[PDB]
Every structure is written in structure tokens, then in C-alpha cells.
């Protein structure tokens, strides 16, 4: 139950996750999903890894084939019970272990979504376990160093206050309240009966312009382009140090085909 990142050698190892015993994730106060990480659960019927329901309905057959894909981890459980909207198809499971730094009090799966005519459900896992590099969040600006972790969001995302965006710094979007943007985005476009779009990730740390005096966080997306399909989603945002009485909300600038641009007035990169 273990898979390496093909780029820097590093070995990631969930193991530690495995076992029959395995955990749940709740769709409701008190209903849970059952899941085990890499072979079956106990609580499900013999092979099926994750099941729910009082009569154990399958939503997809273990296996520990556990793929990397762009700082995610994945495993893709498969063939449970018939679907009723597409004829010929079956429930299924993709477990998304996605990076979280910290301790975080959660530390256990959970639903983000299910696509309702290809039945399939959607886990997300914010795990230490999922991670390679620390929170690259600060950076030195003469004799001081600007932190911007206080604007780390540690349990969901920022709005952007008719198109909406949601976007976190530093780190992935954490898992929020009917929104299901995709696991690992750190920016996240959400149009209108289009799915969330990924148009932005964890690029690196703060860059800082001592001549406009300002600091830009960059982010780039897995996922191609609309127009032209050789270029990346990306995403920018330029911090401007305001004194006021609470930190601002990232406020979108302007756009282009691909790319996006955001402004962020915080009271956090002031002197
Ligand atoms: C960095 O420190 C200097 C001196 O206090 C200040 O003028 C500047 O606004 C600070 N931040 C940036 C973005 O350069
Ligand atoms: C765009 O994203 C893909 C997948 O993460 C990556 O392989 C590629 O290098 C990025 N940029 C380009 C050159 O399209």
C-alpha cells in the first residue's frame, strides 16, 4: 500500500492506513461509509473496500494499486451495485489523499461528492501522510520576514467577493460545504452546470518585488486549458499590506483565456 513520485524519488508509504479494521466517512450526523485503505473491510461484503447502508451496498471492490497523480494520492475502487441512471454500470470509489501539513484535528476520509450517472463517489483524505515539502508560506523582506500563514484557511477555502472562485494559499482547498471543487486545487473556478474546474495549484513559495512592493504567490493546474490546450489554468496573486481591523478577502482582478489574476489587501505583509 505504498507508491513513489516518479520525479524526486520520493517514496510515499499508507500502509500505516491498511487493515480490515479500516475507518468511515460520514454523509450524514450519524450514517457513515465504510472504507478500508488497500484490501477489503469488515464491515462489507468479501473483496468490497468501501460499502454504506444498512444493507451494505458496494461502492467498489478493493484493490492497493495506489497511483500518484500531481502531489494526490489515489486509489480507485471499482464495480459495486447496478446504477439506476446509466443502465450497465457500477458504484465506485475514488479515494483522493490530498496534503495537509498539519496535525488537523479531522484525520479521516471524507465525501465531497458523487456523480450521480457514472456513479461515482468522491472521498477526499487531508493527510500528513500525502505530503513531501513543508508549507512554503513565508518570505524575507529586508531585516523582517512575512509570514502568510495566517491567511492559510485550515479548515475550507476563501470566497472571492456571476462565476464563483474559491482559493486557499499555501495549501490545497480543504474540503467545504456542498462545494466540490477537485482534490488538490488550490485554486478553484465554480461555473454554473459546468463542473468546478481546477485552474490552480500550490506552485511555490512567495515571491517578493522590492521595487512595486509587492508579494506574488503563483499557481499552476494540472488540467489543460479551454482555448488552447498546450497551456495550463494558471493563477496569481499580487498581496498589497493594508492596515485595517481584520485581514482582507482575495478580490479577483482580471482575466485572461487561460490565465487569472487576484489581489489580495491584507493587513499581513505590512512592517
Ligand atoms: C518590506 O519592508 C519595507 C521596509 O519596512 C517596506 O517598505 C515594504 O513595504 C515591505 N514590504 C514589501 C512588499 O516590500
Ligand atoms: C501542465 O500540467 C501538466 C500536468 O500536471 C504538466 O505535465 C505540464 O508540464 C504543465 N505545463 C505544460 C508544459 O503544459
Redesign the pocket.
Known sequence: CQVTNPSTGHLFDLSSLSGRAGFTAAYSEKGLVYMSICGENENCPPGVGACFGQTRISVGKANKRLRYV?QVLQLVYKDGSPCPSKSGLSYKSVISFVCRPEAGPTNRPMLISLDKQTCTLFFSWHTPLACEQATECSVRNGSSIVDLSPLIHRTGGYEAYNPDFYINICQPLNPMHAVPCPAGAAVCKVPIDGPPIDIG?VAGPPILNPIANEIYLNF?????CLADK???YTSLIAFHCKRGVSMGTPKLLRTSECDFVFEWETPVVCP
Not at 499552476?220 to 489543460?224: A, F, G, I, M, V
Open positions: 500531481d495549484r499552476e493546474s494540472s488540467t489543460p498546450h497551456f495550463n
